[PDB]
């Protein structure tokens, strides 16, 4: 096992959604090195590679999630913490 | 062209697999690559398999067949499908005893074919009742049956969400037939590992798909057989790995313990029986075997995490689960315990989340057992020469330990733990490596320890400073980091300030200890700045000769940051005097570089951090800015071609300006001139950003408003040229980003100056084109500008000039309003990711505040012009947006609506 700072929080999960359902949905983006769901239909997913997280935020956000029981919901996928710089070389810029 | 000659493909193959040279092996690869990409690939691969010269070429052919099926399946006429299936089945039949590495590739190909051939329904059934009776067919039939469920999650196949669901339940239907088949295989006397491994890998694979019946598997010989070979010492390493992986798969397949309790019970009891075999494996030096046991254990606790948490100790929550981990944790090899780290995180996270600390007391002893286990794992080798390196493989482990301790410490009590670790540090004549490791775990938690029980806390600090220099380098280092983490105890007990400082100063004067010391010094300066006016003499003296201590750039900056934080607390009178000395050492170093390899970055970064954090309350700094500007302007001008240096140059100037503010007006025009002249030949987008800062700082003063507008209009000419190029927006997102941060500062400091200008017309135009730019930073900057622009025709009606601004925006809205709304709606539905929706909604929102009735028409027109979607859906979306009373509702409307596309 291993962990990363390439983390997204997922929301709007059905209460019957398992971390295995979550991992199965998010693996479309890349390798999941840590996953977990909580009580309130919320979860975290950590990716081995940053670019795979970015894909998840871009492509898996607002998608149809189907739990193992068959419960469907449209989920929210966003980066946990301050977002990553978009492509191109880094620049120091004030934000918020 | 035409298909390559076989002699040629045979030549390229032998190179790729036997030619030691890198340049040639690469060349063969591309040609074989083009062969694979080509249409001839099918035919060549098929020939190579019929000829079956050797293992190499059959492997290349099998792989190519597989690749063409999982990427290029579309370019096959429907009629060809049945024949390709017949080829692959004949091929895997003929080549089954050639090499296993060839059978897998062909097996993979057949699986990829079945998943993509709806005309091949019931393929599992087809395959089994066709090959199960031939005893020599079984190894590749199992292989196909093994890779088929693995390929359902193939990123290489990327089957649609709906088609994938059909697939899985179709497979679920036949899971019995393969289990039945799987049972028959082991259903013999004295079966060898080779057959057993195929059975377990196959079973595990169908478990992972989540289509096996828990209730049928609970009472089934395969499970008993799994734990059986996992108990037997005689079993080989390879049979072990297969058996273990299948157990972890069985566990993983249990998603809800309640629905799969029979299976759950079977697995729980099964794994507890393995502790003897673990000890036997550790009795030998069979590390491969123990790693397997720790994974099975860790997977078990993961599976029953809910029960360990909700109802600990009782039944499913039987805490022997955790004990098995603590056994693994005691193992001298740290690669064993790190297997379990993710479970511990997840366990701690769950206990914390469900805040019912009534139960928490039961876990404390387990965590403190784990912590002591991790404490010894952090011990460096007694023959370690230097400081503890964080970069190496073991230093990585310590950090994962350090992080895990921070997250679990609440279950023990940070104070309880901190004191207890320190106590043990005089008993037993401890070797340096036992002290360091205890100091290390102490540093991990020293921040979270409550300063209420001050006596035990403040005496630990007193213990660390009385350590002699004679102690091991690594002990001096970690104690420096512990002290650094204990700045709040130096803040509450100011008498310890001078001893701590004196101790850190000693470490600073030794080369391999400097950075750790400088960081600790920075912490002290940051937390204890309130009363450190006395020590400033020393900090300044360090600064006067900073590059002598062999510091890292970061530790250096942090040091200067520290001294600047306390300079700001000094009496206002001495600030202006000391600040100039603080900067002079930098200015002198830069001055040398102008007459000098010359890279001014570090002194630019050191100047920048000084300004950034020399922030007193009143100004003394603008006096110093005059001293700085001439050397910066020449530095800037010398490296005006280099973006990286200029960017650091502008960063420095950004913070110098932010420090002062409306003062230091002596720099505005000479900087603007230099910026505009340089930007003319080198379009560094940070001049736009620097420009936005000057506008942010001097935009209200109407004396500067003309000069600032001239700056913008001058900067925009090479800017628009840039964005005018092919892929101009995509290639210069930094320019778009910084251009509209600039435009935004104008539109909120002096809007009318910008709106009545001629340059606003191209700016607005580029904004509308920029709304479809798929670049998050640049797009935020654009949406923000549009929002702030349109809001100007609504904002602050209390001031006089409101009616003028009202008219200017109305014109803009008249001219462009309907095109913007169409663009915004376009980017949401087709171009950009869902995270842009809240930014779009805010622009749309401002348009309603300006003229909702016109907007209702505009939006209606936009929804009218759309290239699957019912008229009812367009209507109620229009209904949702226009009837929104909060901005939030437009976003929800877009969120929902976007899904339709």
> What token pair was written down for B134?
């031939």
Calculate helix-pair angle for B287-303, B261-272, nearest 10 degrees. 150
Q: How far apart are CA B782 and CA B738, in angstroms?
A: 10
CB contact under 8 A, A86 and B741: no
| Residue carrying structure tokens 């938690």 | B445
CB contact under 8 A, A1 and B835: no
Resolution, given in Å to one decimal, reads 2.6
User: B741 contacts in A (CB within 8 Å)?
Assistant: 93
> Of B554, B521, B523, B517, which is closest to residue B540 (Cα–Cα)?
B521
CB contact under 8 A, B734 and A91: yes
User: A18 contacts in B (CB within 8 Å)?
Assistant: 255-256
Looking at the partner chain, which of B158, B298, B353 has a beta carbon nearest the beta carbon of A38?
B353
Q: How far apart are CA B197 and CA B199, in angstroms?
A: 5
CA distances from B767 to B13, B266, B842 (A): 54, 64, 15
Residue of chain A with shortest Cα separation from B157? A28
CA distances from B57 to B12, B17, B65, B395, B549 (A): 10, 10, 12, 45, 62
User: B835 contacts in A (CB within 8 Å)?
Assistant: 57-58, 61, 78
CB contact under 8 A, A3 and B342: yes
| Residue carrying structure tokens 């628009």 | B720
Query: Which residues are CB-contacts of B121 (< 8 A; sequence separation ≥ 6)?
Result: B170
- Give the Cβ contact number of residue B797 at 10 Å: 9
B59-71: burial string, b at 16+ Cβ within 10 Å, e else = bbbbbbbbbbbbe
| Residue A25 within a domain | yes
CA distances from B16 to B13, B26, B109, B652 (A): 5, 8, 22, 53
Looking at the partner chain, which of B256, B733, B835 has a beta carbon nearest the beta carbon of A57?
B835
User: B339 contacts in A (CB within 8 Å)?
Assistant: 1
| Residue A93 within a domain | no
Number of domains comprising chain A: 1
User: B733 contacts in A (CB within 8 Å)?
Assistant: 86-88
Q: What angle do CA B498, B500, B503 make, to 5 degrees?
A: 105
CA distances from B26 to B14, B19, B32, B38, B109 (A): 13, 10, 10, 18, 25
The residue segments making up the domain with residue A30 are 5-81
Q: What angle do CA A32, A33, A37 make, to 5 degrees?
A: 75
Mark out chain B residues that contact chain A at CB-CB < 8 A: 153, 155, 158, 161, 165, 210, 252, 255-256, 298, 338-343, 345-346, 349-350, 353-354, 400, 647, 651, 685-686, 689, 733-734, 737-738, 741, 775-778, 833-835, 895, 898-899
B505-544: burial string, b at 16+ Cβ within 10 Å, e else = eebbeeeebbbbbbbbbbbbbbbbbeebeebbeebbebbe
To probe the interface with A, which of B339, B730, B777 has the most A CB atoms within 10 Å? B777
Q: How far apart are CA B607 and CA B500, in angstroms?
A: 27
CB A16 within 8 A of CB A68: yes
Mark out chain A residues that contact chain B at CB-CB < 8 A: 1-3, 18, 20-21, 24, 27-28, 34, 36, 38-39, 57-59, 61-62, 64, 66, 68, 74, 78, 83, 85-89, 91-93
CB contact under 8 A, B733 and A87: yes
CA distances from B823 to B382, B763, B770, B831 (A): 68, 15, 10, 10
* DSSP state, residue B747: H
Query: Which residues are CB-contacts of B394 (< 8 A; sequence separation ≥ 6)?
Result: B334
Residue of chain A with shortest Cα separation from B341? A1
User: What H or E segment, with its residue span, contains residue B280?
Assistant: helix B275-283
Q: How far apart are CA B849 and CA B344, in angstroms?
A: 52
Residue of chain A with shortest Cα separation from B649? A92
> What token pair was written down for B58?
């059959």
CB contact under 8 A, A93 and B689: yes
Looking only at the bridges linking them, the beta strands covering A76-79 and A64-66 are unpaired
Residue of chain A with shortest Cα separation from B899? A62
User: A36 contacts in B (CB within 8 Å)?
Assistant: 346, 349
CB B813 within 8 A of CB B850: yes
Q: Phi, psi at residue A66, to the nearest 5°?
A: -115, 115
Nearest CA to CA, how far is B693 from chain A (Å)? 10
CB B144 within 8 A of CB B165: no
> What token pair was written down for B722?
């840039």
User: B400 contacts in A (CB within 8 Å)?
Assistant: 3
Sheet of A7-11: strands edge to edge?
A32-37, A43-47, A7-11, A76-79
Can you point out the beta strands (E) in A1-96? 7-11, 32-37, 43-47, 64-66, 72-74, 76-79
Would you state the torsion angle of the CA atoms of residues A5, A9, A10, A11, taken in this order, to the nearest 10 degrees?
180
To probe the interface with B, which of A30, A91, A94 has the most B CB atoms within 10 Å? A91
| Residue A90 within a domain | no
User: A93 contacts in B (CB within 8 Å)?
Assistant: 689, 737-738, 741, 777
CB B813 within 8 A of CB B793: yes
Looking at the partner chain, which of B210, B252, B734 has a beta carbon nearest the beta carbon of A68?
B210
Nearest CA to CA, how far is A6 from chain B (Å)? 15
Q: How far apart are CA B797 and CA B799, in angstroms?
A: 6
Q: How far apart are CA B213 and CA B219, in angstroms?
A: 11
CB contact under 8 A, A3 and B345: yes
Looking at the partner chain, which of B155, B342, B835 has a beta carbon nearest the beta carbon of A1?
B342
| DSSP characters over B494-559 | GGGHHHHHHHHHHHHTSGGGHHHHHHHHHHHHHHS-TT-TTTHHHHHHHHHTGGGS---HHHHHHH
Q: CATH no. for residue A48?
A: 3.30.70.330
Sign of the alpha-carbon dihedral angle for B523, B525, B531, B534: positive
Q: Give the SS3 label for residue A8.
A: strand
Q: How far apart are CA B542 and CA B545, in angstroms?
A: 5
Domain borders along chain B are: 1-901
CB contact under 8 A, A20 and B210: yes
Looking at the partner chain, which of B165, B349, B833 has a beta carbon nearest the beta carbon of A58?
B833
| Residue A28 within a domain | yes
Q: Phi, psi at residue A79, to the nearest 5°?
A: -70, 135
Q: How far apart are CA B206 and CA B173, in angstroms?
A: 12
> Of B481, B557, B485, B488, which is closest to residue B529 (Cα–Cα)?
B488
CB B760 within 8 A of CB B754: yes
Looking at the partner chain, which of B158, B651, B777 has a beta carbon nearest the beta carbon of A86?
B777
CB contact under 8 A, B833 and A91: no
Q: What angle do CA B224, B227, B229 make, to 5 degrees?
A: 105
Q: How far apart are CA B516 and CA B136, in angstroms?
A: 66
């Amino acid at each position: 096992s291993r962990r990363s700072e390439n983390r997204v929080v997922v929301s709007g999960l059905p209460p019957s959604g398992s971390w295995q359902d979550l991992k199965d949905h998010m693996r479309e983006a890349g390798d999941v090195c840590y996953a977990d769901v909580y009580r309130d239909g919320t979860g975290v997913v950590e990716f081995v590679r940053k670019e795979d997280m970015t894909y998840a935020v871009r492509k898996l956000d607002n998608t149809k999630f189907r739990s193992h029981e068959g419960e469907t919901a449209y989920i929210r996928v966003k980066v946990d913490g301050p977002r990553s710089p978009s492509y191109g070389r880094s620049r120091s810029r004030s934000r918020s | 062209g035409a298909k390559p000659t076989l002699q040629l493909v045979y030549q390229a193959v032998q190179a790729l697999y036997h030619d030691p040279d890198p340049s040639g092996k690469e060349r063969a690869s591309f040609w074989l690559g083009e062969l694979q990409r080509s249409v001839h690939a099918w035919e060549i691969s098929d020939q190579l398999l019929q000829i079956r010269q050797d293992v190499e070429s059959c492997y290349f052919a099998a792989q190519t067949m597989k690749m063409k099926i999982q990427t290029s399946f579309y370019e096959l006429p429907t009629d060809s499908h049945a024949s390709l299936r017949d080829s692959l089945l004949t091929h895997i039949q003929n080549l089954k005893d050639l090499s296993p590495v060839i059978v897998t590739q062909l097996a993979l190909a057949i699986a990829d074919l079945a998943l993509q051939m709806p005309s091949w329904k019931g393929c599992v059934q087809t395959l089994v009742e066709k090959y199960s009776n031939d005893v020599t067919s079984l190894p590749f039939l199992l292989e196909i049956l093994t890779v088929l469920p693995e390929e359902v999650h193939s990123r290489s196949l990327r089957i649609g969400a709906n088609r994938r669901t059909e697939i899985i339940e179709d497979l679920a239907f036949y899971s019995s037939t393969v289990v039945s088949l799987l049972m028959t295989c082991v259903e013999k006397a004295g079966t060898d590992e080779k057959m057993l491994m195929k059975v377990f890998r196959c079973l595990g694979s169908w478990f992972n798909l989540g289509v096996l019946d828990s209730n049928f598997m609970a009472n089934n010989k395969l499970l008993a057989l799994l734990f059986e070979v996992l108990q037997q010492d005689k079993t080989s390493s390879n049979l072990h790995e297969a058996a273990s992986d299948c157990v972890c798969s069985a566990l993983y397949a249990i998603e809800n313990v309640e629905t799969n309790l029979p299976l759950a019970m079977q697995l729980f009891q099964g794994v507890l029986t393995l502790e003897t075999a673990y000890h036997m494996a550790v009795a030998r030096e069979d590390l491969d075997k123990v790693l397997n046991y720790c994974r099975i254990f860790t997977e078990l606790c993961e599976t029953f995490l809910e029960k360990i948490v909700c109802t600990p100790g009782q039944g499913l929550g039987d805490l022997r689960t955790l004990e098995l981990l603590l056994i693994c944790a005691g193992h001298p090899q740290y690669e064993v315990v790190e297997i379990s780290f993710n479970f511990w995180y997840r366990l701690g996270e769950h206990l914390y989340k469900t805040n019912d600390e009534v139960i928490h007391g039961i876990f404390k002893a387990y965590i403190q057992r784990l912590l002591h286990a991790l404490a010894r794992h952090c011990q460096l080798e007694p023959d370690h020469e230097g400081v503890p390196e964080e970069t190496d493989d073991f230093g990585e482990f310590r950090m994962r330990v350090s992080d895990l301790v921070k997250d679990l410490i609440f279950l023990i009590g940070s104070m309880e733990c901190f004191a207890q670790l320190y106590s043990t540090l005089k008993e037993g004549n401890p070797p340096w490596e036992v002290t360091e490791a205890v100091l290390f775990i102490m540093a991990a938690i020293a921040k979270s320890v409550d300063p209420e029980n001050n006596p035990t806390l403040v005496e630990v600090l007193e213990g660390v400073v009385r350590l002699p220099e004679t102690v091991h380098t690594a002990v001096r280092y970690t104690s420096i980091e512990l002290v650094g983490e204990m700045s709040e105890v130096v803040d509450r007990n100011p008498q310890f300030l001078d001893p701590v400082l004196g101790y850190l100063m000693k470490g600073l004067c030794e080369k391999p200890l400097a950075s750790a010391a400088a960081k600790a010094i920075h912490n002290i300066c940051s937390v204890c700045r309130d009363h450190m006016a006395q020590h400033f003499n020393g900090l300044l003296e360090i600064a006067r000769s900073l590059d002598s201590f062999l510091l890292s750039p970061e530790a250096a900056v942090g040091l200067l940051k520290g001294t600047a934080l306390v300079l700001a607390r000094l009496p206002l009178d001495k600030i202006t005097e000391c600040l100039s000395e603080l900067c002079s050492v930098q200015v002198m170093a830069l001055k040398k570089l102008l007459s000098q390899s010359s890279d001014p970055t570090v002194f630019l970064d050191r100047l920048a951090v000084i300004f950034r954090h020399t922030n007193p309350i009143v100004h003394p700094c603008q006096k110093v800015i005059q001293e700085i500007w001439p050397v910066l302007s020449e530095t800037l001008n010398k490296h005006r071609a280099d973006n990286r240096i200029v960017e650091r140059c502008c960063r420095c100037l950004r913070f110098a300006v932010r420090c002062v503010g409306k003062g230091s007006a002596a720099l505005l025009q000479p900087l603007v001139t230099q910026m505009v002249n340089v930007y003319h030949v080198h379009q560094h987008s940070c001049f736009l950003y620097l420009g936005s800062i000057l506008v942010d700082e001097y935009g209200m003063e109407e004396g500067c408003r003309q000069g600032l507008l001239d700056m913008l209009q001058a900067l925009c000419i090479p800017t628009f040229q840039l964005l005018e190029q092919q892929n101009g927006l995509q290639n210069h997102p930094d320019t778009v980003d910084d251009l509209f941060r600039l435009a935004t500062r104008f539109i909120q400091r002096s809007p009318v100056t910008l709106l009545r200008s001629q340059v606003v017309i191209p700016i607005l135009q580029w904004a509308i084109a920029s709304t479809t730019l798929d670049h998050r930073d640049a797009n935020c900057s654009v949406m923000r500008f549009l929002r702030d622009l349109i809001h100007t025709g609504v904002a602050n009606d209390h001031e006089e000039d409101f009616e003028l601004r009202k008219e200017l925006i109305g014109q803009v809205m008249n001219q462009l309003g309907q095109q913007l709304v169409s663009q915004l709606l376009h980017t949401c539905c087709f171009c950009l990711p869902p995270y842009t929706l809240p930014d779009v909604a805010e622009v749309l929102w401002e348009i309603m505040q300006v003229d909702r009735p016109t907007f209702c028409r505009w939006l209606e027109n936009s929804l009218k012009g759309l290239p699957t979607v019912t008229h009812k859906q367009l209507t109620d979306f229009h209904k949702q947006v226009t009837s929104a009373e909060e901005c939030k509702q437009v976003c929800w409307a877009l969120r929902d609506f976007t899904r339709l596309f």
